[PDB]
Design a protein around this ligand. Sequence first.
Ligand SMILES: *c1nnnn1-c1cccc(C(C)=O)c1
Length: 258
Amino acid sequence: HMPDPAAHLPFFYGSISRAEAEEHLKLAGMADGLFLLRQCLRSLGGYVLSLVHDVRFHHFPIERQLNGTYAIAGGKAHCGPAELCEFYSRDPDGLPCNLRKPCNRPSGLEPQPGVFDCLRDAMVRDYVRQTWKLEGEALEQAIISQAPQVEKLIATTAHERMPWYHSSLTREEAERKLYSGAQTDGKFLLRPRKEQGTYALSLIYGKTVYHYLISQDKAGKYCIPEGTKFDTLWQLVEYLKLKADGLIYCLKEACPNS
Ligand SMILES: *c1nnnn1-c1cccc(C(C)=O)c1
């Protein structure tokens, strides 16, 4: 069972950072129209089309629409990632150039599972079991056939189930909790602040605790101080595990709550 419908594509890397993506493309010798597909870490169920042209990198976010299709911003809709990559191979339709050489995964390397795989394989699975009591091949398919709005809802409160989320911690209590454990770089927790609906990332770097404000837009996207936007806190954390993006350091291991 592969929860991501792009899992069968040889050029799909799963949940990787932009740096690793660009690394794979360089070792593919660069060249115009060299491309790969990866999971989007900001938009739930989405992808990023990583392309190179004029020996410089391009990254096109692909958003999953409500009706289950996929589209680059202002672009046409496609029923799936596979369909999407095939179309753009035969017609740039806004891209700097058409997809040519697929930067396939090197032998041994599988797609990295991320939030989306976990959302479906664990959380939607349990949601489906609780509501319909399905078991075998009926539980699967049902897992990949839920509406994007249901997946979004589960994902939105998923952080409440994560060990790094501390539902009631002051700034001072967070520091004390972090200093009183292993003071390793990237040790972290997330905590709600007074103002609805703001949160704080508390992390250790150089044996010093740092606090970062997280606020959500009027669009409901969760924003780090650098301004990068995420559908969920869960995605925000998983993203910062792979890229600092205005943090003094990446998130590594959770400071456990209970
Ligand atoms: C995702 N992929 N494997 N396991 N998970 C996961 C992590 C934390 C919580 C949950 C729940 C409660 O479903 C699943």
